[PDB]
Amino acid sequence: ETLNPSARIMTFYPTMEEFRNFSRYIAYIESQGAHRAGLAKVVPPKEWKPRASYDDIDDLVIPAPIQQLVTGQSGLFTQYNIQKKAMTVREFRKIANSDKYCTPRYSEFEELERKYWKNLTFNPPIYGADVNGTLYEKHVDEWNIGRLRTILDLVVNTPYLYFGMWKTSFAWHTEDMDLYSINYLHFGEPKSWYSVPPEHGKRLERLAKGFFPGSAQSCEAFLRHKMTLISPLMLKKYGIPFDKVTQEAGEFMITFPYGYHAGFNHGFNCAESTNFATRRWIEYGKQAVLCSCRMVKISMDVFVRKFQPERYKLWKAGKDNTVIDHTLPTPEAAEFL
Ligand SMILES: [Zn+2]
Numbered sequence: 001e002t003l004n005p006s007a008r009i010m011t012f013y014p015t016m017e018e019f020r021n022f023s024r025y026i027a028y029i030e031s032q033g034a035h036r037a038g039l040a041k042v043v044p045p046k047e048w049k050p051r052a053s054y055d056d057i058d059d060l061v062i063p064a065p066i067q068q069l070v071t072g073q074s075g076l077f078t079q080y081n082i083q084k085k086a087m088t089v090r091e092f093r094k095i096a097n098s099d100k101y102c103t104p105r106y107s108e109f110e111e112l113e114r115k116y117w118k119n120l121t122f123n124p125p126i127y128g129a130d131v132n133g134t135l136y137e138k139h140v141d142e143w144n145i146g147r148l149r150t151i152l153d154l155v156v157n158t159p160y161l162y163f164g165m166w167k168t169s170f171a172w173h174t175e176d177m178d179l180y181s182i183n184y185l186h187f188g189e190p191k192s193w194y195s196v197p198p199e200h201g202k203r204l205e206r207l208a209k210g211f212f213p214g215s216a217q218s219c220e221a222f223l224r225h226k227m228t229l230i231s232p233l234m235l236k237k238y239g240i241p242f243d244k245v246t247q248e249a250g251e252f253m254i255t256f257p258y259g260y261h262a263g264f265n266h267g268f269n270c271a272e273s274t275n276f277a278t279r280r281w282i283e284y285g286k287q288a289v290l291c292s293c294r295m296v297k298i299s300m301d302v303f304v305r306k307f308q309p310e311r312y313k314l315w316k317a318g319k320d321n322t323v324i325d326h327t328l329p330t331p332e333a334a335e336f337l
């Protein structure tokens with residue numbers, strides 16, 4: 001509780017030596033209380049690059065671009081997807097940068113954030129989302145989203161590319177199975193993020209359930225449909241604590257177990273993402289409320305038998321009454337504490 005009491009989004013600048021061990025660095029940022037915010041930024045060493053150039057990806061296929069139709073008013077919105085036929089990065093970039101879809105003129109991020117929440121429902125953009133693949137070169141061993149080699153490998157552990165344009169969005173959600181996530185912004189215009197501290201996650205859900213009663217009756221985890229957009233002003237009006245951060249090209253974002261996040265793309269960009277885990281996630285995975293209507297489901301037995309043997313028979317019987325302390329860092333953070 002003494003580390004990051006404010007539960008603000010923290011930014012880290014590892015050296016090349018510190019950067020070489022992924023899992024150890026996550027253990028480090030947790031010892032500093034980075035997890036309390038639910039979101040952290042890692043700016044890698046200047047010399048590190050996962051690929052020499054991105055000039056050879058014009059004919060990369062985006063199998064399922066999605067047109068994002070948003071409906072709503074007064075800070076509350078629902079986003080509907082319209083799957084379009086496959087398109088190439090070249091075709092996507094032409095559309096992203098055209099007069100119809102390009103980023104508007106602005107001076108400060110605050111002005112662009114205002115234009116986003118003002119025009120979210122107009123001129124629906126296209127998101128080249130969830131493309132199976134990696135933009136990492138084969139020889140890259142540091143922070144390779146393709147091969148993190150965390151405890152999740154015991155199994156959602158494959159990489160996805162997201163090609164964004166101005167105003168494309170990701171709705172409020174937590175990772176599948178309340179897992180961790182890593183997001184690398186390969187190139188292009190920034191990506192803005194909002195996060196709710198895991199310790200206040202239940203407050204967001206209670207607010208979401210109050211505003212979408214129909215959705216709440218149909219599903220016990222309706223936010224996992226990733227359709228719900230709620231503005232910072234609406235979170236402020238209902239006392240939901242949150243923080244905001246802008247991710248720029250060449251920066252990593254780490255999301256933590258039960259860390260609610262949302263956000264939007266400033267313009268044409270490309271991000272790579274995957275889920276991962278630490279010993280700390282096991283309890284989150286066991287207690288995750290899943291979409292019952294409807295999805296991604298990991299069997300927790302293999303994790304419990306290996307990392308909680310003393311509790312394995314107790315848990316299988318439905319007697320593991322363990323209550324999660326969101327402020328506690330991962331056990332692997334011991335060497336830093
Ligand atoms: Zn996410």
Ligand SMILES: [Zn+2]
Nearest residue numbers: 219291292293
């Ligand atoms: Zn559902």
